[PDB]
């Protein structure tokens, strides 16, 4: 016997990163899983060092954030790595979900459903993150968001006031958000392990969607180094952002301290929620807007039930590819609209794009699968 194979602790490592039979043909798109892994740790590490100087009190919140960038040695990179890493975490998250959708990976129900929980969790996590500096966008973002929950009939007012710790986004609300933003990423990690636990029952899918038992390779030279090369590419993207354009994806207004009387004309989320934001305001209703806001994310849990094709991947399905790319293109439209005022053009296009999003996933994509089956005489 070996040492790697038999030791209780090393076994786990061996079975997950060394001797794990992996398909020989997975491409970049499969890298986002390890990249999310890196982003999770990067968020935790820079997140901890910030917590060593950050104050959770409205009196000194902004000041402590400023204290970090001017006074704390190298406090600024840590702060921007954190901020930009959160965006890197969403770019990877979106690649990952999309990869799963195109390739049929969702057929691993538990893995995928756990993945949905992971998406929601980092979303809930990042939202609370952004409130912490107590900028104008932090406060008004915190306000606009939480208040959505007041549309829930009979329970909504009490619910919003319960999470607020008052009648507004005040002292109680900031400290609160700190605590939850600290504990959430650890829980995320425990869930990322369960995610990887379910994934291991089958091993990875691959571009063709066809089983690869016939040609597996060890994760041990091939995917360790391909993940390495890929993390280096994540570092480039992140560092390019932080050492050259640290505010590019940021809102210059979150730089003005919170003012509960000053409502900026602006008022929009961080870019990663813009598509959902666009879907929300497309509806001339308080309940429906938030009902459809929720449904724009929870729909990923309906996807496996709407698989209709006899093939797993999209590699061999042209009609489906077009529909997929129209989903991604529709999601650009949604974010773009979400980052725009609710005035002319913008209302009706963002209204129709919302319908398209749901017409696409719920009706068009399945119908295409049936048609494709038929063309193949299946």
């Amino acid at each position: 016997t070996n040492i790697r194979k038999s030791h209780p602790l090393m076994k786990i490592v061996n079975n997950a990163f060394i001797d794990l039979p992996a398909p020989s043909n997975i491409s970049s798109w499969w890298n986002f899983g390890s990249l999310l892994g890196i982003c999770l740790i990067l968020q935790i590490l820079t997140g901890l060092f910030l917590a060593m100087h950050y104050t959770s009190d409205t009196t000194t919140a902004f000041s402590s954030v400023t204290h970090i960038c001017r006074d704390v040695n190298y406090g600024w990179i840590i702060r921007y790595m954190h901020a930009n890493g959160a965006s890197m975490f969403f770019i990877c998250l979106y690649m990952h979900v999309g990869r799963g959708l195109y390739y049929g990976s969702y057929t691993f129900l538990e893995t995928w459903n756990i993945g949905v929980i992971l998406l929601l969790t980092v979303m809930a996590t990042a939202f609370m993150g952004y409130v912490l500096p107590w900028g104008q966008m932090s406060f008004w973002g915190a306000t606009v968001i939480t208040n959505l929950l007041s549309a829930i009939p009979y329970i909504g007012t009490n619910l919003v006031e319960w999470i607020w710790g008052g009648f507004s986004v005040d002292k109680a609300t900031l400290t609160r958000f700190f605590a939850f933003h600290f504990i959430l990423p650890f829980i995320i990690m425990a869930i990322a392990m369960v995610h990887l636990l379910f994934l291991h029952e089958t091993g990875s899918n691959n571009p063709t969607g066809i089983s690869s038992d016939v040609d597996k390779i060890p994760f041990h030279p091939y995917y360790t180094i391909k993940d390495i090369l890929g993390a280096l590419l994540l570092i480039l993207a992140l560092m390019l952002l932080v050492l050259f354009a640290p505010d590019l994806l940021g809102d210059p207004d979150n730089y003005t301290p919170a003012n509960p009387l000053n409502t900026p004309p602006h008022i929009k989320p961080e870019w990663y929620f813009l598509f959902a934001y666009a879907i929300l305001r497309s509806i001339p209703n308080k309940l429906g807007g938030v009902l459809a806001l929720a449904f724009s994310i929870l729909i990923l849990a309906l996807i496996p039930l709407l698989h209709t094709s006899k093939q797993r991947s999209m590699m061999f399905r042209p009609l489906s590819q077009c529909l997929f790319w129209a989903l991604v293109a529709d999601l650009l439209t949604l974010t773009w609209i979400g980052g725009q005022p609710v005035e002319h053009p913008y209302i009706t296009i963002g209204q129709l794009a919302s319908v398209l999003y749901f017409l696409l996933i719920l009706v068009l994509m399945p119908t295409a699968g049936t048609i494709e089956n038929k063309l193949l005489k299946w």
């Binding site: 000041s63 990179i77 180094i225 280096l232 480039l236 050492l243």
Partner: protein, 241 residues
């Protein structure tokens, strides 16, 4: 009112990806802050010691702090006296409560300067175009004689008077204090107060690009070398009969 105009693209000496600040220009801009702006603008986040590594020297920075009075801590009686000025203090001065700014300038606050460049939309360009580009009210739009005119302002009803040609200055070696010139410097300095890490970051960023340009191909070649075995593998199927 609901109509607006966007600032041009001025060739700041710190616009390029790997471009430092003109530290001589941050000085004069600090000078502009010191007399003019300071009387109304709070720069709560910058201190005297912050200038040391940047523009001035230990000695000079001490002296500039000594030209004001702070209100130091209490002693035996529970007091509140005055002190020359250290290096340790910051620049919080104008007036206490935000309401005092309003009482003075009239229901308007000259928003704190320490974070301005980074808080506008358009950086130094918004501010430069504002300060330099003051003009005269066209037809039918009357103001409120405290609401001056600036095209580069939301709604165009601004509460700030144009204070850039009031030619003050101590351009030590010799630099003319034209409206243009005082404005470049004041914005160049403002860039710095909003983003003090600016230069050092671009030095790291330079190094990040050189390291990556060395590391990227190398890790790629390491990975290709190991994937070799698979890329040139040849298969053959040899069934019975």
């Amino acid at each position: 009112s609901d109509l607006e105009l966007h600032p041009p693209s001025y060739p700041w000496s710190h616009r390029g990806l790997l471009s430092s600040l003109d530290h001589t220009s941050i000085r004069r801009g600090f000078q502009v802050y010191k007399q003019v702006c300071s009387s109304c603008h709070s720069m709560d986040y910058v201190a005297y010691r912050h200038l040391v590594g940047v523009c001035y020297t230990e000695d000079e920075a001490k002296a500039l702090a000594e030209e004001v009075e702070v209100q130091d801590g209490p002693n035996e009686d529970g007091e509140m006296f005055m002190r020359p000025g250290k290096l340790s203090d910051y620049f919080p001065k104008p007036y206490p409560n935000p309401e005092a700014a309003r009482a003075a300038n009239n229901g308007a606050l000259p928003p704190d300067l320490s974070y301005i460049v980074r808080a506008r939309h358009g950086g130094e360009d918004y501010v430069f175009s504002l300060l330099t580009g003051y003009c005269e009210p066209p037809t039918g739009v009357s103001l409120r004689e405290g609401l001056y005119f600036n095209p580069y302002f939301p709604g165009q009803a601004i509460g700030m008077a144009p204070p850039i040609y009031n030619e003050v200055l101590e351009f030590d070696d010799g630099t003319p204090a034209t409206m243009s010139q005082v404005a470049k410097d004041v914005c160049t300095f403002l860039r710095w107060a909003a983003e003090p890490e600016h230069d050092h970051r671009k030095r790291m960023g330079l190094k990040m690009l050189l390291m990556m340009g060395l590391l990227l191909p190398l890790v790629y070649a390491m990975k290709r070398h190991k994937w070799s075995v698979l890329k040139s593998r040849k298969l053959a199927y040899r069934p019975p009969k």
